[PDB]
Design a protein that fits this description.
The structure is cut from a larger assembly and holds chains A (73 residues) and B (140 residues). Chain A contains one helix and two strands; from the N terminus they run E-E-H. Chain A is an alpha+beta fold and 73 residues long. Chain B has five helices and no strands. In chain B, helix 4 (65-76) crosses helix 5. Classes of the chains: A alpha+beta (73), B mainly alpha (140). The chains hardly touch. The PDB classes it as viral protein.
Amino acid sequence: RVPVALHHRDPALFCANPDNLNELRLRDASYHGLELQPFGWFMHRAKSRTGYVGTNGLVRTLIWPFIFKNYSV
Amino acid sequence: NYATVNDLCARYTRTRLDILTRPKTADGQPDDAVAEQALADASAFIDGYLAARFVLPLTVVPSLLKRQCCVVAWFYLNESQPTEQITATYRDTVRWLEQVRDGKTDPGVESRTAASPEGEDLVQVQSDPPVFSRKQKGFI
């Protein structure tokens, strides 16, 4: 029983739990949000900077130079 | 014409208007067509002085233009021997019309509804279609 296809879902579909702020939960129009079904969600959290799941992305650092460069251009 | 003879004979006494008009007619009796012709010539004068920055078949007539037509018609009707004051007031209204043409003074409005006469675009510029302007919400 092995995987036959790995579909990359859009990252916007996942909202972090308001509690413990480190468990990605599939959005289901709920306050807590639907948790991930076990053994069915390949999650890779690449933490370049220590912190929570939303913080550790490089978009937090790169949004400012992006804005400055594109406005200047 | 901007002003009717019934207004020129009110601002200026009708008896003096008859005195000025009765020689000019062919018969020699008081006439009304002479005054209307003078008013038409004065209205043509004002029209020429206003067509610089207005659509000349005026949608709304400024209320002072009746006075400005009566004075010019009166001066045009005293061309043989005018009083000094008539000449001075004619020079004043020519100065006012020059100021209106230049842009120093607007003619006014219709006193009934305070509407200013429209006119063609004094200033008009055309450029190539705008690209990379801030209105292009793309990119950014």
